[PDB]
Design a protein around this nucleic acid. Sequence first.
DNA 1: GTACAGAACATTTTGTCCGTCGA
DNA 2: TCGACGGACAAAATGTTCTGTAC
Lengths: 10, 326, 323
Amino acid sequence: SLLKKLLLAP
Amino acid sequence: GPPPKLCLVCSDEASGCHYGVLTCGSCKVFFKRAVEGQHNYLCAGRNDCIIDKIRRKNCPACRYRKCLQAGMNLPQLTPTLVSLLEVIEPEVLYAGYDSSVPDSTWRIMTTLNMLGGRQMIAAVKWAKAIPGFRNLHLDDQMTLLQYSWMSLMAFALGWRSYRQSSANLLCFAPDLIINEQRMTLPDMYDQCKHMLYVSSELHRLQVSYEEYLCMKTLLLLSSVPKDGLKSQELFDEIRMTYIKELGKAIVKREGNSSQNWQRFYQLTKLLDSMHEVVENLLNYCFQTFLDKTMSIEFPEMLAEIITNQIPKYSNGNIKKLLFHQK
Amino acid sequence: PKLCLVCSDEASGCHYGVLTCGSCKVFFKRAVEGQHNYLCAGRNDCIIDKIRRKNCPACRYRKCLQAGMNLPQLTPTLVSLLEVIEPEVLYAGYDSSVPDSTWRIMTTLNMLGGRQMIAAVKWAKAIPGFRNLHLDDQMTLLQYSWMSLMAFALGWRSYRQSSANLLCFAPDLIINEQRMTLPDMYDQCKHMLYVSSELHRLQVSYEEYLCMKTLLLLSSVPKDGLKSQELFDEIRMTYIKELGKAIVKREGNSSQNWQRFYQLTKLLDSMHEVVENLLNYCFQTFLDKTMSIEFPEMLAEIITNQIPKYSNGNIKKLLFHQK
DNA sequence: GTACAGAACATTTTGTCCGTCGA
DNA sequence: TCGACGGACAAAATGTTCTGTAC
Ligand SMILES: C[C@H](NC(=O)C(C)(F)F)[C@H](Oc1ccc2c(cnn2-c2cccc(C(=O)N[C@@H]3CCOC3)c2)c1)c1ccc2c(c1)OCCO2
Ligand SMILES: C[C@H](NC(=O)C(C)(F)F)[C@H](Oc1ccc2c(cnn2-c2cccc(C(=O)N[C@@H]3CCOC3)c2)c1)c1ccc2c(c1)OCCO2
Ligand SMILES: [Zn+2]
Ligand SMILES: [Zn+2]
Ligand SMILES: [Zn+2]
Ligand SMILES: [Zn+2]
């Protein structure tokens, strides 16, 4: 979920 | 009186048609000297220096390259895709390596893993800025980075090593350069040689900056899940765009109909060998990560990708894209 | 270890406020006095190092101002013998007045290669202690390492006659980039090119090359051992010691010498994969009934006798690093 | 009577050796 | 005695003119 959170944030 | 003929190489007034090309006197003898002289001219810039009357003494690597692009033998305020790639190119990060303390395989590999984690963070923000990446599904974006992170790291490291240390050393960061002393350290040599092949090929091929920028984006789009992606139809047209983009950079560089293909052949042939470089780099990285006895430190970001990748390669659910064999 | 803050060459003192070499001191004093319009050909971030300081004067002057500048021999040695018996350079006999072909080039190189392989036999027959081995070992070692010897000798010739960038096969048949992209040629050249690249990367000596090639002849052995294994093991470690002696003759620092032996013996090891990959294409071509490339009888005999040894696993490839 | 290749001279740019002079 | 400055000298890199030679 750490890689996903980097993608999701603007 | 007739309009002065121009030198197809330095744009100064041409003295005639020397060595098949409309060239000046200074450019003619520079070319006869480069051929017979046996020189391994290196570029201080990025293999795309401007050759003109004022700057022809500047770079002999790019002047001798321009003589071959013109054919010797014996506006621009409309952004392009590669002009965006240049502007979104990640910055140089420092390792934070304490040089006042003796080297060790553990300290060197730990520092580079902790650095590689930060390089990965930038590689994510870089991917988001590539035109069309955030258009694809989130599960596809996550997959593409997970699959091609080592292609992007060994490609950008190879280019930094090519440019900064004449392709002799690995230039991980300005403060952590794997020299001849550090390479002969335990468990170092073999992994460094794989990174050095990338640098040694970029050296042999004299890759230009625009070409490198295109090959790097193409590396992100080089490993796909065996069955496909959630937005595979879109993925294909995106990858196809950067192949045409690479071809555009090869047209500037070569300036010749038959040269343009021989060039495309080699760059795309290198892009293929990158799968074998990453295959070998990941074999040792995965072995080290699982090796409890070595106990080297991997950051919270990188460890997460490593764990979620080990059974995907050992599953065969990875369709490696090729330009030449298949 | 004093280094120039501008060109990274060995600094000669504290010049004009900064620790620089002599060449940068006068570059700076010149660039200041001579009111110059130094234009950069790149992006004003050119690399200023020893080799490329002559290149961008605009970037060198910028780096200067950034750093803070302002105003009786009769006893022959083992390696001396290897120098004498080292084979002469041969000629491919390639007529360059007719366009190039993959068939024409591979066939000419196979023909020259056959002759180079005969010269390897006369050369091995003269290596001190090699003639002492059993004849059915002298020919086993010659058969196993044949491609290792030819690739390493070609790699040395390519390194010597230019740098890593091309393949100097014969004085009359050099393989340039336009020749390399002929059908089927690229992948086979890629392996040969590596050997010249490593020889270049390491800046290998002639005395080091001579010793390494002898170790390449003694690099592959039979899985069931040689008929003269007592003597082969003794000959091999004599040449390993000889390679070390040739590394001594260079720098001379204990750790520098050890590291050089590590890198040199790592290359001697990698030659097993370089030869394994060179043979896969050679054997594929030899059997191919579409390409029709002709191999000389000298090399055809070796290829035929080596294909089933390769499959059966009767080749014990020796390793210095055993990783 | 033009137009090139290569050699011969020439200029430009870069790098070293050395004496001076202050500390 | 040492260490830096600059001048004098040298090497490397680049550029021009003259000549032969093919039309
Ligand atoms: C995870 C690996 N760990 C293992 O394999 C191991 C050995 F620990 F097991 C780790 O890999 C890398 C690979 C590249 C790395 C780093 C650190 N910096 N760079 C780098 C440099 C320049 C640019 C970019 C870059 O990507 N820049 C932008 C982002 C995208 O666009 C451009 C990245 C770590 C590794 C660690 C130590 C190693 C090693 C390999 O190989 C040699 C022996 O020591
Ligand atoms: C058998 C191969 N044929 C195939 O693999 C193929 C293509 F047919 F499949 C053949 O190999 C070689 C390998 C080295 C060769 C030659 C010819 N001269 N040298 C050489 C040069 C310098 C030194 C020495 C040497 O040994 N000197 C001393 C004597 C002993 O001590 C030292 C030998 C042919 C080959 C053919 C064509 C190739 C090719 C490879 O590679 C690229 C694509 O074209
Ligand atoms: Zn010109
Ligand atoms: Zn350049
Ligand atoms: Zn300097
Ligand atoms: Zn510059």
